[PDB]
Symmetry: C4
Subunit: 91 residues, 4 copies
Amino acid sequence: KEFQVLFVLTILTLISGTIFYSTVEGLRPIDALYFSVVTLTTVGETPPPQTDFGKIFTILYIFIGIGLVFGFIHKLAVNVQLPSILSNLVP
Amino acid sequence: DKEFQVLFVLTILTLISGTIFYSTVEGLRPIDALYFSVVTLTTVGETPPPQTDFGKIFTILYIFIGIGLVFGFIHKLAVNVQLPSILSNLVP
Amino acid sequence: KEFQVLFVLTILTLISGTIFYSTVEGLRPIDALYFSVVTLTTVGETPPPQTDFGKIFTILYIFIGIGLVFGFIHKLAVNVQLPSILSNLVP
Amino acid sequence: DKEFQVLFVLTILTLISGTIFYSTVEGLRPIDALYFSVVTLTTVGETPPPQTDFGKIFTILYIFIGIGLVFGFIHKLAVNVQLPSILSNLVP
């Protein structure tokens, strides 16, 4: 764990996104955070960024961030969720 | 398996929870609530975003907690249900 | 190969989608095909289905189809694209 | 590596081709054409769909040919560039 470092790295990445989109795209922080989340996890169900600076940043953000996010989701699943789910089936 | 069934139940549960939540909080018809849940977790996710802050927060936690399970299911479905059945189908 | 079977399975899946969305959602076949593709590959950048029958079908379609599609993309990449790219670097 | 660089070049190439195509055919500003290409291949893909049938056909072939490369890149980037650099960063 590894898991913790992964979790922190993600939090950091999301905070940076939240600050950026909140500042540059003029989004409320909750909307800025959400964009960051649905974008990196590829859910992306939002309109696109309106600013060229947002567009460029988002492009770099996606390539730098996806890998980390999915490594986190992967580690979360394989090392946190699986053992909890497993334990909860011990009769 | 046992694994496949557990995976299938876990998914169903996750989807039902989503369905209940989005139907209640976002005021969505259950079929629309179910669909949002499915396309969101599988990352399709091709609808407008949630309109409530509570929907937004939940959906964020939902995505991180749920994606892994969903894809583990799709993975097990594919590798242990579709492939064998599927494979023969080609048995002459 | 394996690749071929994968390729056929995909084609079949996409054709079924193309017929369905074209018929039920009243989409032009090119738009029906496209929906099927961007949905299964999860790109999904289209409005959602308008009919409840479309919504239900699409739900089953996604769970049955994603795995096949990505198995195809995976096999395409690892067994078709890699050897071509590799060959094309032999000086 | 060599692998990382080749992967990086292949991606750049793929994106440039997309940029040229969508900018020309869909009449998109290059920055918008580039962005569409990126969010589409990485599957984000959160914009309206292509408006031309030629755009639609191309984008279909683009997706199947390009996703694999893009994700192989993101994978190699992550596993061989970010992880080491990254790892130390934690070296005390």
